[PDB]
């Protein structure tokens, strides 16, 4: 219910990184309430306000848009692959909530494709974000090439409908990044990477056969993807997994997973909650859209 998560509505503040941290919960809150149509009980009046906090966050983020179309905490700081990708991820989901300038969104996509993708399909970070707590399970990752490549790939694909026409190179870049994930998927060890790369492949229709089998068998009790350590990482990983399941239309596997996410009684917010918050409510919102 919407009341357990009224704290997600918040004013965005800070520089290029923290501003996105603040913008995160409000964007996904409006997105999830729109989908489950709960503004009626929660309060129809509350929505238009949330909408302008979102517009505010977006406008404030433009201050950190560099001439390259890339983003960093400060204009004088080398642009971040992850942050730019994350802005694409967030703006893409918010285009139907507020007015996003395509030149901004598609500029960032193009920059990722033309500057930060390696010949073998991998996406590379040359200027890590300061606030490492905002990147979720990506933070301390052995399988970092795979994890980061999947993360960027997911952003590119969620920006596809909007940017494909203005960016000829998008489908090519997507395919090449897909090649890398597929070539290395079977050797993944961490469930986090299996879930996020899994979703990235699923969007492409390339999560199948042995890869699909690995994705499904990697889960525990057929209801969660987890690794020893921060629990927020597992919430994030399982959200990615659920979205993969929905992409596969495997509605038989969904119920236990959705149940586990709910039983977590996680309502977003808190330190280092950015990815977990965005992903869990994107995942659950998608579940409502699709079911049954």
């Amino acid at each position: 219910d919407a009341e357990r998560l009224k704290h997600l509505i918040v004013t965005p503040s800070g520089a290029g990184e923290q501003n996105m941290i603040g913008m995160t919960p409000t964007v996904i809150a409006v997105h999830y309430l729109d989908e489950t149509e709960q503004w009626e009980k929660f309060g129809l009046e509350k929505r238009q306000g949330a909408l302008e906090l979102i517009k505010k966050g977006y406008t404030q983020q433009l201050a950190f848009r560099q001439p390259s179309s890339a983003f960093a905490a400060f204009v004088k700081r080398a642009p971040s692959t992850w942050l730019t990708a994350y802005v694409v991820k967030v703006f893409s989901l918010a285009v139907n909530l507020i007015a996003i300038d395509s030149q901004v969104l598609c500029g960032a996509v193009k920059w990722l494709i033309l500057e930060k993708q390696k010949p073998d399909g991998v996406f590379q970070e040359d200027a890590p974000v300061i606030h490492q707590e905002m990147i979720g399970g990506l933070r301390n990752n052995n399988e970092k090439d795979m994890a980061l490549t999947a993360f960027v790939l997911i952003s590119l694909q969620e920006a596809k409908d909007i940017c494909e026409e203005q960016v000829n190179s998008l489908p090519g870049s997507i395919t090449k990044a897909g090649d890398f994930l597929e070539a290395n998927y079977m050797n993944l060890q961490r469930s986090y990477t299996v879930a996020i790369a899994g979703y990235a492949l699923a969007q492409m229709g390339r999560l199948k056969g042995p890869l699909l089998n690995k994705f499904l068998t990697t889960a525990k009790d057929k209801n969660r993807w987890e690794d020893p350590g921060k629990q927020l990482y597992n919430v994030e990983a399982t959200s990615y997994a659920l979205l993969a399941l929905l992409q596969l239309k495997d509605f038989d596997f969904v119920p236990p997973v959705v149940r586990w996410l709910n039983e977590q009684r996680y309502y977003g917010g808190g330190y280092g909650s950015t990815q977990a918050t965005f992903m869990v409510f994107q995942a659950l919102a998608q579940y409502q859209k699709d079911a049954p």
Binding site: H7, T11, A63, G270
Partner: protein, 125 residues
């Protein structure tokens, strides 16, 4: 020039029992629910068969510990554990250890208004 029943307001009510008709020059008073703040004239009067403009009841704010943690801030006075803030009431935040007030941030002191509280952000030092 009698008037009908007084208009309703969110999170408030009149101090008297409502009647279906009021005589000219009549008046009634509103008060808001606990922690809600009255804005405008608490009294309304019937002039020429019409009620004067009613007041609003401005929302209190709730201090979110989730938002604070996410913004690397903490309450300055933690034994005096305020949960709600009346509109017009202010709070003092401090940065958590290892962080400093960020460049593009609201002041560490902030005032609740109609349910809206602007939390300051503290960045890695």
């Amino acid at each position: 020039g009698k008037c009908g029943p007084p208009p309703p307001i969110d999170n408030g009510d009149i101090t008297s029992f409502p009647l279906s008709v009021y005589a000219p020059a009549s008046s009634v008073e509103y008060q808001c629910q606990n922690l809600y703040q009255l804005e405008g004239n608490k009294r309304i009067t019937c002039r020429n068969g019409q009620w004067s403009e009613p007041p609003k009841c401005l929302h209190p704010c709730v201090i979110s510990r989730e938002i604070m943690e996410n913004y690397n801030i903490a309450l300055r006075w933690t034994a005096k554990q305020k949960l709600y803030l009346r509109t017009g009431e202010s709070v003092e935040f401090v940065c958590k250890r290892g962080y400093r007030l960020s460049s593009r941030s609201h002041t560490l002191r902030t005032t609740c208004w109609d349910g809206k509280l602007e939390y300051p952000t503290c960045a890695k030092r």
